[PDB]
Every structure is written in C-alpha cells, then in structure tokens.
C-alpha cells in the first residue's frame, strides 16, 4: 500500500493515496506531493472532483482493489480502527475525524477501499463524513452530509 | 471502341471489388472452426 | 499431447501445438515445422489470425479439448507452473514470458486449453500477455494489452 502525505512547507497538509486502476491524489488541498515519481505527473481535476489521473508506469499499477456495490454494515478497517455502518458513514468517535488529515481511504476488511473521505468534520454526538464512491452501479458519486468540512 | 473498353474495365473493376468484398465476408468465419452456436445468416451453419 | 517446436535453421524459433478439432500452428513466425506429417499440409492464414488449418487424418484428430466460457480465476497449468487470474492474463513472474517461445497454449487444470498466447512480453512489475480465445459465446477473439510483443 502506498498512502502518502502531501508536503506543504515541509509538513503534512494532505494525504495522497494510490488506488487500483488509477493513481489518486486529493486535489482539494495543495502542496508538493512527497513522492518523486508522482512529482512529474500532469493534473486532471474536474469541477467538483479532486482526483489525480493515473500516470504511474504499469509496474506498480493497481496498488489496491476497488470496491463494488452491496455495502455491508460490517467492519471496514480505517486508519483509526474499524468502522461499522451501512446507511451512511460510520459513527466515528468524537474528536476523531477533525481536520488536517485530508485524503484518507476507508477500506474493506477484504482489501477493497469502499470510499474516499472528502470531509465531514462533525455530525453531532457521533460523526459521519462526506465521502465519494460508486453510486449503485459503479458511479463515482460524492455524498456530503450537512455540516461537512474537509478532515 | 471507347465505350466497349470503358464498360468492360468498369465491369472488371466491379468484379474485383466483388471478390475483395467476398474475401471480407469470408473473414468472420474464423469462428467457424471453433464448433460454436449457429449464427443464422446468409451462409449455412448446422 | 503434441506440442512441437518449429524448426528454423535447425533450432527452435516457434512452438506448434495441435488442439481439439483442428490442428494449430502459430503462423506469426516462420520456420519449417519439425513434424513430417504436418510437413505436407497447406496453410490457411487470415489477415490477423496466424492459425493452421486442421488437415491431420482423423485418427489423431482432436488431440485436446477446447475451452468454453465462464473463466474462473483458478489455476491453469502453464508450461512454467500454474497461472491464477480471471480479469485478464495472469500476473506471470518477471523474467518469464520474454521472447523466442512463441505459440504456447495455456490449459485448464481439467485439460481444456483456455487460450493461446500471441505475445505480451511485459506488463510492469508483473506481466500479462496478448492471447486469443473464445470471446463470450465461443468467438475466436484476440485480446492484446498495450506493450505486447510475441513471446
């Protein structure tokens, strides 16, 4: 797995992570990408999408496995423990999921990155997030609960 | 003389194109040796 | 099983292999076929297809069993070990699958030659190949990943 922080002013401001099929960088924030191999790659950002085009030589291509439909409620391994929910983002503990750690992938226990967080700072006594994943049939759609800011 | 020459050359060009198109129509039968489902087209397949 | 190298200048340059139903020779490369029984057989090559017509007397006809649809990801016995993949050609080890060994059949563990390699020298830190087999319904179609040269 290659999940890389983004270098801004010599400190971490983002967190770039490569995914199956295409290499991914969260283009919501800026900062020089730490990896030198990615340091010479053109940027392809859409109006609302903040994703890097996949231009890694196909030796290390598809570092991960993408995620299909049929979301279970079960455990998804997160950087800070497992997450367990199905209707929307898991009720992450308070304090966790704040700010400054943009671009963190949530993966299945089977190695299938279910979604990519793009904010969702607080959602009450619990907290869900604003993320993007396949819609129902494999459509890269973002869902943003109200009160969502990059985390 | 000119008319017979031009009509015969037109006809022979047409028949060469016929042969080439026939070759192209032969090409998909690459699947024929595979012993697969009939295609139900202008040619026969058991 | 009759898999035969192709004799060019008295050394192996290709590898002819007979298949169920029809006898097969990879016509991509040249060289006198080692087998004398095949030495007196007319050649039937298409524009992109490099296959020999089946003109062996029907005593040794259908040396193998052809391969149907529903590709499993499981093990397929290859000349250099088993291969395990489903989306495309298996991630063969680096160094293996180079050049000079054209015309090598990949078989099912059940004796069903799933596909025929026609190149695919390198595909990165792993390697897939350019092969030909039934498409979905039994159609002899070739798939060529980018960066494919005869192996």
Curated annotation (Swiss-Prot), chains A, C:
Site description Involved in dimerization of the capsid protein, residues in chain: 76, 109
Domain Peptidase S3 intervals: 2-151
PTM comment, free text: Phosphorylated on serine and threonine residues.
Active site feature: 28, 50, 102
Modified residue annotations for Phosphothreonine: 3
Free-text domain note: The very N-terminus plays a role in the particle assembly process. The N-terminus also contains a nuclear localization signal and a supraphysiological nuclear export signal (supraNES), which is an unusually strong NES that mediates host CRM1 binding in the absence of RanGTP and thus can bind CRM1, not only in the nucleus, but also in the cytoplasm. The C-terminus functions as a protease during translation to cleave itself from the translating structural polyprotein.
The protein's role, per its UniProt record: Forms an icosahedral capsid with a T=4 symmetry composed of 240 copies of the capsid protein surrounded by a lipid membrane through which penetrate 80 spikes composed of trimers of E1-E2 heterodimers. The capsid protein binds to the viral RNA genome at a site adjacent to a ribosome binding site for viral genome translation following genome release. Possesses a protease activity that results in its autocatalytic cleavage from the nascent structural protein.
Subunit structure: Homodimer. Homomultimer. Interacts with host karyopherin KPNA4; this interaction allows the nuclear import of the viral capsid protein. Interacts with spike glycoprotein E2. Interacts with host IRAK1; the interaction leads to inhibition of IRAK1-dependent signaling. Part of a tetrameric complex composed of host CRM1, host importin alpha/beta dimer and the viral capsid; this complex blocks the receptor-mediated transport through the nuclear pore. Interacts with host phosphatase PPP1CA; this interaction dephosphorylates the capsid protein, which increases its ability to bind to the viral genome.
Protein name as it appears in the record: Capsid protein
Species of the source: Eastern equine encephalitis virus (EEEV)
Lineage, uppermost ranks: Viruses, Riboviria, Orthornavirae, Kitrinoviricota, Alsuviricetes
